[PDB]
Amino acid sequence: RNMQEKGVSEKEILEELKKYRSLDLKYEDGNIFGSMCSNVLPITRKIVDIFLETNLGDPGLFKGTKLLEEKAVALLGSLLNNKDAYGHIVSGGTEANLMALRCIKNIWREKRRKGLSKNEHPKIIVPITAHFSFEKGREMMDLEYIYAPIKEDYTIDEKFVKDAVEDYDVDGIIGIAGTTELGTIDNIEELSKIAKENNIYIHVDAAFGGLVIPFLDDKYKKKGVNYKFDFSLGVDSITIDPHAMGHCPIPSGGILFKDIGYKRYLDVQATILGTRVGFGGACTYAVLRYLGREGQRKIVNECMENTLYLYKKLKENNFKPVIEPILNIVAIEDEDYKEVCKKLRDRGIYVSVVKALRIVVMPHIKREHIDNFIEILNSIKR
Amino acid sequence: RNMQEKGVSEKEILEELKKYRSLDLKYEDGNIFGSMCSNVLPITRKIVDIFLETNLGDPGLFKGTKLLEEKAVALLGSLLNNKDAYGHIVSGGTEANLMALRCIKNIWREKRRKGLSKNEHPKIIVPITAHFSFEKGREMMDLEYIYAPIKEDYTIDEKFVKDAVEDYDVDGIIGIAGTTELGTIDNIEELSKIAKENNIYIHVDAAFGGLVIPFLDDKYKKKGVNYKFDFSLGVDSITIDPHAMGHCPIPSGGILFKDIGYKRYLDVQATILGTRVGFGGACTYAVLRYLGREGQRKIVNECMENTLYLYKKLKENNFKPVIEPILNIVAIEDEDYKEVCKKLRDRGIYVSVVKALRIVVMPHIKREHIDNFIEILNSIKR
Ligand SMILES: CC1=C(O)/C(=C\N=C/Cc2ccc(O)cc2)C(COP(=O)(O)O)=CN1
Ligand SMILES: CC1=C(O)/C(=C\N=C/Cc2ccc(O)cc2)C(COP(=O)(O)O)=CN1
Numbered sequence: 001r002n003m004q005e006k007g008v009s010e011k012e013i014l015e016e017l018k019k020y021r022s023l024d025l026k027y028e029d030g031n032i033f034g035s036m037c038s039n040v041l042p043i044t045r046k047i048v049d050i051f052l053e054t055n056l057g058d059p060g061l062f063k064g065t066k067l068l069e070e071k072a073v074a075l076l077g078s079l080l081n082n083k084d085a086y087g088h089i090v091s092g093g094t095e096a097n098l099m100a101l102r103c104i105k106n107i108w109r110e111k112r113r114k115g116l117s118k119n120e121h122p123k124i125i126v127p128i129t130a131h132f133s134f135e136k137g138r139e140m141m142d143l144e145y146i147y148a149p150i151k152e153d154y155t156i157d158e159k160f161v162k163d164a165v166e167d168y169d170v171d172g173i174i175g176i177a178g179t180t181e182l183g184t185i186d187n188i189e190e191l192s193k194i195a196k197e198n199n200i201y202i203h204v205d206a207a208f209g210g211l212v213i214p215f216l217d218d219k220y221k222k223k224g225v226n227y228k229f230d231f232s233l234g235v236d237s238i239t240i241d242p243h244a245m246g247h248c249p250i251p252s253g254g255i256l257f258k259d260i261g262y263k264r265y266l267d268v269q270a271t272i273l274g275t276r277v278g279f280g281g282a283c284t285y286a287v288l289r290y291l292g293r294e295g296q297r298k299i300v301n302e303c304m305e306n307t308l309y310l311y312k313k314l315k316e317n318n319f320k321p322v323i324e325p326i327l328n329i330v331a332i333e334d335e336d337y338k339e340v341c342k343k344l345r346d347r348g349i350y351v352s353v354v355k356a357l358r359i360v361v362m363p364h365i366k367r368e369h370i371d372n373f374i375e376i377l378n379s380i381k382r
Numbered sequence: 383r384n385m386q387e388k389g390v391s392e393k394e395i396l397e398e399l400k401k402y403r404s405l406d407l408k409y410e411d412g413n414i415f416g417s418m419c420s421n422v423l424p425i426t427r428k429i430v431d432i433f434l435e436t437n438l439g440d441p442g443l444f445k446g447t448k449l450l451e452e453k454a455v456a457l458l459g460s461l462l463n464n465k466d467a468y469g470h471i472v473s474g475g476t477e478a479n480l481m482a483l484r485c486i487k488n489i490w491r492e493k494r495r496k497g498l499s500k501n502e503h504p505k506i507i508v509p510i511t512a513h514f515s516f517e518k519g520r521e522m523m524d525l526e527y528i529y530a531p532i533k534e535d536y537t538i539d540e541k542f543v544k545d546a547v548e549d550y551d552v553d554g555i556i557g558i559a560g561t562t563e564l565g566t567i568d569n570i571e572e573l574s575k576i577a578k579e580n581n582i583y584i585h586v587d588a589a590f591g592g593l594v595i596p597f598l599d600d601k602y603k604k605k606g607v608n609y610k611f612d613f614s615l616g617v618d619s620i621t622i623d624p625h626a627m628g629h630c631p632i633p634s635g636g637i638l639f640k641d642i643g644y645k646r647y648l649d650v651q652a653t654i655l656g657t658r659v660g661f662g663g664a665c666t667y668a669v670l671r672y673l674g675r676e677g678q679r680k681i682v683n684e685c686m687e688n689t690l691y692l693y694k695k696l697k698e699n700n701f702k703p704v705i706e707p708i709l710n711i712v713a714i715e716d717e718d719y720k721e722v723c724k725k726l727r728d729r730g731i732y733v734s735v736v737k738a739l740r741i742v743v744m745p746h747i748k749r750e751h752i753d754n755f756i757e758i759l760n761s762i763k764r
Contacts, residue, residue: 001453001457002456002457002465003460003461003670003674004671005675006676007672007674007676008672008674013425013668013671013672014425014428014668017432017664018432019446020664021432021433021447022446023446024443024445024447025443026435031443035437035440036657039435045431047399048430048434049427049431050399050400050403053408053409053421054406055417058417058419060732061406061407061414061732062407064401064402064403064404065402065403074383078383083384091473091633091658092655092658094654094655094656095654095655098654102522132650135650139650140654141523141524142524241657243657249434250437250657250658250659251473251655268514268517272518272654274475274514275419275474275475275476275623275632275633275635276632276633277632277633282402286395286396286398286399289390289395290391290392291389292385292386292388292389293386293387294387294389295389350442350443
């Protein structure tokens with residue numbers, strides 16, 4: 001508990017907080033196997049402190065922090081082969097996807113006002129592998145989704161999309177570059193061709209994959225898998241999150257549009273949030289500058305090294321991975337996955353739960369953690 | 383800016399960032415007069431550091447940080463006279479208002495599914511003084527707003543609301559406890575009576591006022607103004623933001639519902655955001671514990687002292703305040719307000735822009751800043 005009249009000392013409240021923090025898991029401890037967040041680059045702690053008292057909801061008061069957001073967006077745009085990208089460092093991939101959906105809906109609204117659409121709601125083709133943020137957008141914005149099926153490799157069925165675009169009036173297409181559950185990559189090149197030929201907005205959700213795919217060594221690329229996903233394909237927008245594989249503190253999400261022409265369709269401030277952090281843009285810019293491509297490549301392929309190590313140890317121990325990994329994500333088929341996940345928790349191993357256990361090999365997962373995991377899983381299986 | 387192959391040193395990137403930060407204004411410098419954010423309580427810098435690598439989007443991994451969010455919500459609920467409040471420490475007042483609107487809409491949706499509503503969209507009574515986040519919600523969620531007029535004192539016209547509820551089928555009422563432009567307080571007691579008698583959900587936007595009104599000394603209360611706004615009136619939800627007058631770092635917004643029965647109407651995670659900070663809840667709990675009611679009362683009435691000082695100096699210098707201040711907000715009538723605001727900027731004074739200059743007397747505004755402001759404004763007026 002209740003609000004009290006008298007205050008307490010700093011030592012008292014800090015000691016209480018540290019007691020609660022001790023109940024948390026920590027990324028570096030070998031417990032967390034199912035998270036797409038990880039330890040932040042240590043330099044970001046100083047940056048957060050420097051920029052803590054900024055607010056990109058009032059950029060007129062923080063001109064330098066606003067310039068750093070623009071520079072962060074420019075570095076992401078350059079990474080994605082688009083020097084003219086218009087975008088924002090937002091709160092996460094959810095706000096980024098919601099902003100893309102707002103844009104899609106407002107393009108549709110303009111058509112409706114001219115009589116150029118028989119759809120009473122925007123009609124959007126969305127693969128069934130789409131992240132839950134897309135359901136939040138549908139539920140809030142009254143969108144109609146045409147759920148696209150996936151093929152045997154768990155990527156979107158491009159022929160279905162092409163057929164649906166022929167039959168139906170379609171207002172948007174979603175493709176995923178690094179799905180949440182398995183890390184697979186939709187055929188963005190074909191989707192973008194369908195979209196361009198039919199004048200349909202295409203959004204690429206690269207929340208996770210956007211900071212992984214551009215850095216993959218050829219050893220980890222698979223024949224037949226297409227890795228192109230960015231603005232070189234002419235897509236309309238891309239979600240890409242520094243607080244996932246960019247080692248930046250939450251909140252650091254990213255939404256990039258092809259050019260500034262898209263800004264007018266975000267009119268109602270283009271972000272959903274009002275008051276909002278300035279340190280996300282500063283950290284995004286600084287981490288990408290500090291690492292350069294070489295530093296991020298090292299981290300990404302270190303994760304891929306450990307991902308393929310985990311995949312190999314799984315098969316050696318007669319476990320069945322859902323797929324050979326595409327990104328730093330592996331899933332283990334298990335009919336008793338719910339109970340096995342709970343047994344793993346009791347032994348200090350936290351995976352996520354497709355009837356499978358899901359492991360995200362973030363930079364905090366080392367070979368010793370994978371060895372420990374296999375030992376505990378073997379033991380659980382009798 | 384362009385992405386580079388080679389990284390740069392920490393000294394290089396920190397020096398670049400500090401150069402951009404030097405272009406920002408800082409709260410403590412006597413420049414910022416129109417912001418509802420201010421300096422954070424210094425202890426929160428340590429808390430941010432401790433909880434930087436947490437994520438309340440995956441609370442199963444951070445049980446202690448999640449408990450601290452629940453305790454933060456409980457302290458706010460206790461402040462608002464509701465020990466059973468269900469709520470979240472979200473990204474800000476915008477997400478908080480959007481979540482209340484989602485709840486209103488889902489209550490309406492349940493009625494529509496039963497044939498209990500002739501409204502094709504939720505119909506919500508909203509005063510014309512409402513914050514822009516309400517327009518974001520209307521635009522995203524396809525809500526129908528009945529804009530309520532305001533009286534001569536700039537508070538919502540309760541008779542209009544009562545008449546509209548008699549004539550129309552209404553799905554929600556919004557009342558504001560501390561408006562953005564003038565800091566006035568709607569007659570929540572009467573609105574809540576109308577709402578309860580007609581079975582209408584009522585949301586109170588106390589984003590700013592929620593951490594001011596409960597701490598006002600009687601000297602600053604005005605005869606005829608009602609200051610009751612919280613769950614003692616039986617309202618359904620209240621937005622209240624620690625990163626406004628709670629001295630907590632962004633992002634620290636708050637949304638409290640009357641009880642846990644409201645959670646089911648937030649189903650599609652109840653927050654809009656997915657991955658999200660854990661330090662907002664930790665800071666909210668710790669700042670309120672560290673200060674206690676006595677510490678927040680001191681700060682609030684210090685701001686009110688300087689607010690009434692500013693109001694007195696304005697009248698002494700023949701300026702016309704829009705209203706005698708209710709909260710720590712004063713607005714100066716000026717036909718040339720746009721040009722005067724620009725002239726003030728050129729002289730280092732940043733107000734916001736009702737045909738008036740708006741000053742928010744946050745804790746960083748001291749008597750010397752108000753004296754400086756009057757001198758510059760006098761000088762500008764020839
Ligand atoms: C493809 C895609 C995603 O996998 C995704 C998040 N995914 C996973 C978010 C997560 C992170 C850590 C953790 O412990 C649990 C979950 C989002 C939303 O991104 P967010 O708002 O930053 O969470 C969009 N697209
Ligand atoms: C009554 C009400 C508000 O005045 C409000 C914000 N108000 C002002 C936000 C602001 C803060 C600092 C600044 O420099 C400029 C603007 C919000 C939204 O709160 P937010 O998402 O935390 O910005 C809701 N209701």
